[PDB]
């Protein structure tokens, strides 16, 4: 299958620099032109730049052009994307796309995220909720940067009935809560814990929803 | 320098099995040169206006030319996805803002659950009341919050998910931020629920005690 992979993204400093990679399998690299697209959430998707089969003739949003650097190497079949004195416009999720020879995209990879600000990465704290046939249950995520976290009830197991919000940014500081919803037989039976990861600050934390 | 790709549409109402068509207006002529995509990454739907790539089934029509191009799917399921158009005809390559589907369904009263502040948020000095309104449809709901009977705007955060692309209902969280301080200083705190399936709210509350 045709299969895109970005590089590490994460959180870096207003005015830094730094280079993206896309590793291209499944399909003869330099038979393509290729492009990187960008994308913050709620206002849609932005092209970035694109390059052509053998890297002869690249083109840009000139609103980039200053900035930012498209290249590949065609031996390692890999697309790279250089940006300098990033700004936090530059925050977004990074795509590398496959672009046909009428120009549109027929495959894209994961993407990746960059978060370009000075605030600082600060951990979640993790509250828990506690309160007929059905019970609802939740977590409470308060006070961390930045997004995203990953929640899950009883290390994924637990994955009917789950709502998790979208996130709330408040003074740079980010606040979501899901809840699980099971049989009121079941618990507290059967515990459940909901399970906070976020990886910008190397932390999980677990929390098991008792009876106050 | 700049041609512009509208999707007017943000939504496109339309039921279980149905038809339905996106539409997407370039503000120069952009021929035949237009992609559309879906999106939860996004996948390649059709290029060239009418062409559709192998392997995408042919549920998917498209369809314009000049500047209105359209885009229709039969037989829409309950999914997760937003329908997005593109022009490649010059650079910059530009895309539209994007057209969400909202699947029809029965009306569903929320359920709701209000949760008191925790003995760790307390310890730090802040006092978060949690409300969720669960799996309920039309899409439309208000929440309000008492303290004491009295009505309580400044500190609410509400958060909204997507339709669900299972049983296509709509829920929210409202979250009532306080000090220690002041919520040590009240009694009763109510979340309020106001929802087409009834003419009375639903409330949940709890005392303090």
């Known amino acids: 299958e045709v299969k895109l992979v970005e590089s590490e993204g994460g959180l870096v400093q207003p005015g830094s620099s730094m280079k993206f990679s896309c590793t291209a399998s499944g399909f003869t690299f330099s038979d393509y032109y290729m492009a990187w697209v960008r994308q913050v959430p709620g206002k849609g998707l932005e092209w970035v730049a694109n390059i052509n089969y053998d890297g002869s003739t690249p083109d840009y949003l000139d609103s980039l052009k200053s900035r930012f650097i498209i290249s590949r190497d065609n031996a390692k079949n890999i697309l790279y994307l250089q940006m300098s004195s990033l700004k936090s416009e530059d925050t977004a999720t990074y795509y590398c796309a496959r672009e046909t020879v009428v120009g549109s995209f027929d495959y894209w990879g994961q993407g990746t995220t960059l978060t370009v600000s000075s605030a600082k990465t600060t951990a979640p704290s993790v509250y828990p909720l506690a309160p007929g046939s059905s019970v609802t249950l939740g977590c409470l995520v308060k006070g961390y940067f930045p997004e995203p976290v990953t929640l899950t009830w009883n290390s994924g197991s637990l994955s009917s009935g789950v709502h998790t919000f979208p996130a709330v940014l408040q003074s740079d500081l980010y606040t979501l809560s899901s809840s699980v919803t099971v049989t009121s037989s079941t618990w507290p039976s059967q515990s459940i814990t909901c399970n906070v990861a976020h990886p910008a600050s190397s932390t999980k934390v677990d929390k098991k929803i008792e009876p106050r | 320098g700049d041609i512009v790709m509208t999707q007017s549409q943000k939504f496109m109402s339309t039921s279980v099995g149905d038809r339905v068509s996106v539409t997407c207006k370039a503000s120069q002529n952009v021929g035949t040169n237009v992609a559309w995509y879906q999106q939860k990454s996004p996948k390649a739907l059709i290029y060239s206006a009418s062409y559709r790539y192998s392997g995408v089934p042919d549920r998917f029509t498209g369809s314009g030319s000049g500047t209105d191009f359209t885009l229709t799917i039969n037989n829409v399921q309950s999914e997760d996805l937003a329908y997005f158009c593109?022009?490649?005809?010059?650079?910059?390559?530009?895309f539209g803002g994007g057209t969400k589907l909202e699947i029809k369904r029965a009306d569903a009263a929320p359920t709701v659950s209000i949760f008191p502040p925790s003995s760790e948020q307390l310890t730090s000095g802040g006092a978060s009341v949690v409300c969720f309104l669960n799996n309920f449809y039309p899409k439309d709901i208000n929440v309000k919050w008492k303290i004491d009977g009295s009505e309580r705007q400044n500190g609410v955060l509400n958060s909204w998910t997507d339709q669900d692309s299972k049983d296509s209902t709509y829920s929210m969280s409202s979250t009532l931020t306080l000090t220690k301080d002041e919520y040590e200083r009240h009694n009763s705190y109510t979340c309020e629920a106001t929802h087409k399936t009834s003419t009375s709210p639903i409330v949940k509350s709890f005392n303090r005690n």
């Open positions: 593109q022009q490649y005809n010059s650079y910059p390559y530009t």
